[PDB]
């Protein structure tokens, strides 16, 4: 019937103001009620806004729902942003027979100065290669915000296979961490002079390199 | 107050049958629509089924149509979601909601239940040591955990005696279904020739314990 | 035999014929519009129901709705058996795409004249079917 579209992720600072959009593809945004749901990790979602602009008891006056008919989208506005607001936010609307959810926007409350990623790259261990297994491990720690993109380079050409990377996870110091892996055969590891792991963080890349022992 | 307590679920295999329960309390049960909402790992919320007060109306999306069945019990105050002929895609966190049909929103959510569907059988982890590398003056050394199923795997360094600078990275999911994680510890680079570093990998699902000593190269 | 009730869908069907009809999709979101059925016979043998191209609140006609306020959500829901108090009532249902036809049959005389309401909901639009069944006519 239609599709609700949300930004993948946004970020603001404490005490600022953020507006999360929910664009309806086909039809009018005002023809159907819109609801907003806050979702923390490992926790039940809680209703934040109902029928367009109504706010249930227990929801702070910070959150407000709005309908922007010019952009055909709904907006969840959060004034005086708090770190407790950092979660996922989903919009919802119902057409007869189907319940539509947006993709969800992972809000990020920038709570500390921006940190550059610490990139450590290990070669396949001695014991790794003897079992005819090869694995390149690129540990990424101490970076904030928690959003990085990794690109591996066999020799110095792009790799498009065998790459597996974890989604960014929050550390104990509120910074984030992630780890990338590259499966190889021991014949692919030694036929190349080196292998390099590039960690793009906030548009700035940090690269490390290892070579066959 | 209104409470929604979910039950059922666990670990199943494709082709089997599951039935989740959701015990409702604190309101007149026969006066509200109830729904099931799931969240797949690394994905957004997805609606599964809605049933009216006395089941006069039932909705499904085309994904689970015919595979799932939603019903309710007036006397037991319980909502159910019968699952048959499952898939690995159905592995998600299944929530239970009370609905206000006249306003098209979910005002109360359940505590969430976890359903995991997989065919990869149990397998212990192959543990490989990671020789230290610079960070100079600071060295980062660890040990690898590869090709195990299922979660979780706990790693301790020096049988709990080494806690300073220990960071166990969350595991990654390989395509087959197996997992892989890494536990690294940062130590002063002067003690590489005088300290014995040994990570203790524990995998209770397969009852596999591996101790791998890490030495320099 | 005709259905004493309200067709809210734009699907005109010969499978079910309704006495009254009002296209819900032409009603405003903020309008208070109802379609009214009034039975006044000494004894009854009538089909009563509605065709809603959206959602029906409550689960009519086993449940019905007797209002006392201009509330947004019902939550004052009674059952047709206890409200009409005519004993065994035959209930019906049929589908036609998004069209939902819910009916009930009343045969005989009822003790006290009673009125009740059913809601057809389409998006933000909302129309009421209010039926009144007299005791003696
Ligand atoms: C009318 O009938 C068609 C086909 O039977 C169906 O697809 C549609 O949902 C029905 N209702 C409306 C309002 O068109």
Q: Find the CATH number of the domain harbouring B152.
A: 2.60.40.10
Domain total of chain B: 2
C-alpha torsion sign, points C103, C109, C110, C112: positive
B125 shares a domain with B108: no
- Joined together, the tokens standing for residue B79 give 């909502």
Looking at domain A112-212, its CATH class is mainly beta
B112 with B133: CB under 8 angstroms?
no
B142 with B201: CB under 8 angstroms?
no
B118 with B175: CB under 8 angstroms?
no
CB count within 10 Å of CB A153 equals 17
Beta bridge partner(s), residue A50 = A54
SS3 B88: helix
Residue ranges of alpha helices (H) inside chain C are 80-84
Domain total of chain C: 1
- 10 Å CB burial of residue B21 (0-12, 13-18, 19+) is middle
Beta bridge partner(s), residue B186 = B140
Rounded Cα distance, A83 and A15, in Å: 9
**Is the distance from the beta carbon of residue C11 to the nearest atom of ligand 1 less than 6 Å?**
yes
Contact check, Cβ <8 Å, C98/A95: no
C-alpha torsion sign, points A159, A162, A167, A171: negative
| Cβ–Cβ contact B74 with C under 8 A | no
Judging contacts by C-beta atoms under 8 Å, the chain B residues touching residue A121 are 133
Task: State the DSSP H helix or E strand holding residue B62, giving kind and residue range, or none if neither.
Answer: none
Beta bridge partner(s), residue B72 = B79
C98 with C6: CB under 8 angstroms?
no
B130 shares a domain with B112: no
Rounded Cα distance, A122 and B118, in Å: 31
Closest residue of chain B to C125, computed from CA coordinates: B102
Closest CA to B117 of B93, B151, B91: B91
Contact check, Cβ <8 Å, A179/B107: no
- 10 Å CB burial of residue B193 (0-12, 13-18, 19+) is exposed
Q: Among residues B76, B100, B119, which one ends one of the domains?
A: B119
**Is the distance from the beta carbon of residue C37 to the nearest atom of ligand 1 less than 6 Å?**
no
CB count within 10 Å of CB A132 equals 9
- Joined together, the tokens standing for residue C106 give 């009343």
User: Which residues belong to CATH 2.60.40.10 in chain A?
Assistant: 1-111, 112-212
SS3 C121: strand
Closest residue of chain B to C93, computed from CA coordinates: B56
- Joined together, the tokens standing for residue C51 give 């065709």
Q: Among residues B119, B134, B149, which one ends one of the domains?
A: B119
Taking the C-alpha atoms of A30, A35, A41 and A44 in order, what is their torsion angle to the nearest 10 degrees? Answer: -160
Exposure letters A87-121 (e unless 16+ CB within 10 A, then b): bbbbbbbbbbeebbbbbbbbbbbbeeeebebbbbb
Q: Among residues B119, B148, B168, which one ends one of the domains?
A: B119
Rounded Cα distance, A31 and A26, in Å: 11
Which residues are within 8 A (CB) of A21 and not within 5 positions of it... i.e. 6 or more apart? A6, A7, A71, A73, A74, A75
Closest CA to A2 of A27, A32, A30: A27
Contact check, Cβ <8 Å, B52/C126: no
Give Rg (Cα) of chain A.
Answer: 22
Q: Could you tell me the residue range of the domain that residue B148 belongs to? A: 120-216
Closest CA to B35 of B25, B55, B50: B50
B26 shares a domain with B39: yes
Rounded Cα distance, A211 and A155, in Å: 10
Rounded Cα distance, C22 and A77, in Å: 39
Rounded Cα distance, B27 and B31, in Å: 9
Exposure letters B134-172 (e unless 16+ CB within 10 A, then b): eeeeebbbbbbbbebbbeebebbbeeeebeeebbbbbbb
- Joined together, the tokens standing for residue B76 give 């037991």
Closest partner CB to B109 (pick from A45, A51, A122) = A45
- 10 Å CB burial of residue C120 (0-12, 13-18, 19+) is buried
Which residues are within 8 A (CB) of A127 and not within 5 positions of it... i.e. 6 or more apart? B128, B129
C110: left (phi over 0), alpha (psi -120 to 50) or beta: beta
Rounded Cα distance, B68 and A192, in Å: 51
Residue A58: alpha-carbon gap to chain centroid? 28
B113 shares a domain with B8: yes
Backbone angles phi, psi at A76, to 5 degrees: -100, 110
Rounded Cα distance, A80 and A63, in Å: 9
Rounded Cα distance, B123 and B149, in Å: 5
Rounded Cα distance, A163 and B26, in Å: 50
Closest CA to C49 of C116, C122, C134: C116
Rounded Cα distance, A188 and A194, in Å: 10
Pairing of strands B78-84, A105-110: unpaired
Give Rg (Cα) of chain B.
Answer: 24
| Cβ–Cβ contact A95 with C under 8 A | yes
Closest CA to C117 of C101, C127, C104, C128: C128
- 10 Å CB burial of residue A41 (0-12, 13-18, 19+) is exposed
A91 with A35: CB under 8 angstroms?
yes
Closest CA to A142 of A111, A115, A110: A115
Q: Whose CA is nearest to atom 14 of ligand 1?
A: C11
**Is the distance from the beta carbon of residue C7 to the nearest atom of ligand 1 less than 6 Å?**
no
B153 shares a domain with B70: no
Closest CA to A104 of A156, A167, A41, A182: A41
Rounded Cα distance, A195 and A123, in Å: 9
SS3 B127: strand
Q: What is the 3-class SS of chain A, one letter each residue?
A: CCCEECCCEEEEECCCCEEEEEEECCCCCCCCCEEEEEECCCCCCEEEEECCCECCCCCCCCEEEEEECCCCEEEEEECCCCHHHCCEEEEEEEECCEEEECCCEEEEEECCCCECCEEEEECCCHHHHHCCCEEEEEEEEEEECCCEEEEEEECCEECCCCEEECCCEECCCCCEEEEEEEEECHHHHHCCCCEEEEEEECCEEEEEEECCC
**Residue whose token pair is 């499952």:** B86
Cis peptide before A145 (omega within 30 of 0): yes
- The CATH code belonging to domain A1-111 is 2.60.40.10
| Cβ–Cβ contact B54 with C under 8 A | yes
CA distances from B130 to A210, B102, B141, B143, C110 (A): 13, 60, 6, 5, 86
A183 with A162: CB under 8 angstroms?
yes
**Is the distance from the beta carbon of residue C98 to the nearest atom of ligand 1 less than 6 Å?**
yes
CA distances from A124 to A141, A184, B24, B125 (A): 20, 9, 54, 17
Which residues are within 8 A (CB) of A182 and not within 5 positions of it... i.e. 6 or more apart? A135, A136, A138, A152, A159, A162, A163, A164, A195
Rounded Cα distance, B126 and B128, in Å: 7
Closest residue of chain C to B27, computed from CA coordinates: C75
**Is the distance from the beta carbon of residue C132 to the nearest atom of ligand 1 less than 6 Å?**
no
- Joined together, the tokens standing for residue A138 give 């690129």
Rounded Cα distance, B119 and B102, in Å: 42
Rounded Cα distance, B64 and C22, in Å: 35
Rounded Cα distance, A66 and A47, in Å: 15
- 10 Å CB burial of residue B101 (0-12, 13-18, 19+) is buried
**Residue whose token pair is 């019968």:** B82
C120 with C50: CB under 8 angstroms?
yes
SS3 C83: helix
Rounded Cα distance, B203 and B209, in Å: 6
SS3 C112: coil
Residue B16: alpha-carbon gap to chain centroid? 19
- 10 Å CB burial of residue B64 (0-12, 13-18, 19+) is buried
Closest partner CB to C56 (pick from B31, B56, B100) = B56
SS3 B51: strand
- Joined together, the tokens standing for residue C88 give 């065994």
Residue A32: alpha-carbon gap to chain centroid? 29
SS3 B90: helix
**Is the distance from the beta carbon of residue C96 to the nearest atom of ligand 1 less than 6 Å?**
yes
Closest CA to B2 of B103, B75, B96, B104: B96
A79: left (phi over 0), alpha (psi -120 to 50) or beta: beta
Closest CA to B72 of B20, B115, B110, B37: B20
B91 shares a domain with B14: yes
Q: What share of chain B is helix, strand, coil (3-state, %, to 5)?
A: 5, 55, 35
CA distance B76 to chain A (A): 23
- Joined together, the tokens standing for residue A6 give 């949300």
Q: Could you tell me the residue range of the domain that residue C135 belongs to? A: 1-137
């Amino acid at each position: 019937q239609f599709v609700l579209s949300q930004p993948n992720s946004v970020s603001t600072n404490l005490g600022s103001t953020v507006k999360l959009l929910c664009k309806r593809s086909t039809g009018n945004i005002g023809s159907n009620y819109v609801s907003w749901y806050q979702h923390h990790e490992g926790r039940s979602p809680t209703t934040m806004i109902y029928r367009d602009d109504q706010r249930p008891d227990g929801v702070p006056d910070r959150f407000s729902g709005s309908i922007d008919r010019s952009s055909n989208s709904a907006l969840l506005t959060i004034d005086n942003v708090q770190t407790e607001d950092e979660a996922a936010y989903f919009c919802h609307s119902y057409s007869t027979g189907m319940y539509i959810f947006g993709g969800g926007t992972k809000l990020t409350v920038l709570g500390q100065p921006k940190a550059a990623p610490s990139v450590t790259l290990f070669p396949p261990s001695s014991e790794e290669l003897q079992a005819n297994k090869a694995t390149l491990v690129c540990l990424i720690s101490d970076f904030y915000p928690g959003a990085v993109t990794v690109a591996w380079k066999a020799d110095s050409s792009p790799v498009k296979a065998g790459v597996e990377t974890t989604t960014p996870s929050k550390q104990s110091n509120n910074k984030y961490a992630a780890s990338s892996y590259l499966s190889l055969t021991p014949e692919q590891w030694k036929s190349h002079r080196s292998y390099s792991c590039q960690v793009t963080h906030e548009g700035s890349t940090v690269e490390k390199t290892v070579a066959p022992t | 107050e209104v409470q929604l307590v979910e039950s059922g679920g666990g670990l199943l295999q494709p082709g089997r049958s599951l039935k989740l329960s959701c015990v409702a309390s604190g309101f007149t049960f026969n006066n509200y629509w109830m729904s099931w909402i799931r969240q797949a790992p690394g994905k957004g919320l997805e609606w599964i089924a809605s049933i009216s007060n006395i089941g006069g109306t039932i909705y499904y999306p085309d994904s689970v149509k015919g595979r799932f069945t939603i019903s309710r019990d007036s006397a037991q105050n319980t909502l159910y979601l019968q699952m048959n002929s499952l898939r690995s895609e159905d592995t998600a966190t299944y929530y239970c909601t009370r609905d206000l049909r006249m306003s098209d929103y979910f005002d109360y959510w359940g505590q969430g239940t976890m359903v995991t569907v997989s065919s990869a059988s149990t397998k212990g982890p192959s543990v490989f040591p990671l020789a230290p590398s610079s960070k100079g003056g600071t060295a980062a050394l660890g040990c690898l955990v590869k090709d195990y199923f299922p979660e979780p795997v706990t790693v301790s360094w020096n049988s709990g005696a080494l806690t300073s600078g220990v960071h166990t990275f969350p595991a990654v999911l390989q395509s087959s279904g197996l997992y892989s994680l890494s536990s690294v510890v940062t130590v002063p680079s002067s003690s590489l020739g005088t300290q014995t570093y040994i990570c203790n990998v524990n995998h209770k699902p397969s009852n596999t314990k591996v101790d791998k000593k890490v030495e320099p190269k | 035999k005709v259905i004493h009730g309200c067709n809210f869908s734009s699907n005109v069907s010969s499978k079910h014929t309704f006495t009254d009809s009002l296209d819900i999709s032409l009603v405003d979101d903020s309008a208070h519009i109802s379609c009214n059925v009034h039975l006044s016979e000494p004894k009854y043998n009538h089909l009563v129901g509605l065709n809603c191209p959206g959602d029906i609140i409550p689960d009519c006609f086993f449940q019905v709705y007797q209002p006392e306020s201009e509330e947004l959500e019902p939550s004052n829901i009674v059952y047709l058996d206890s409200q009409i108090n005519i004993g065994d009532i035959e209930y019906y249902e049929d589908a036609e795409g998004d069209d939902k036809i819910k009916l009930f049959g009343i045969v005989g005389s009822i003790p006290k004249t009673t009125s009740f309401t059913c809601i057809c909901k389409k998006d933000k639009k909302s129309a009421y079917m209010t039926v009144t069944i007299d005791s003696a006519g």
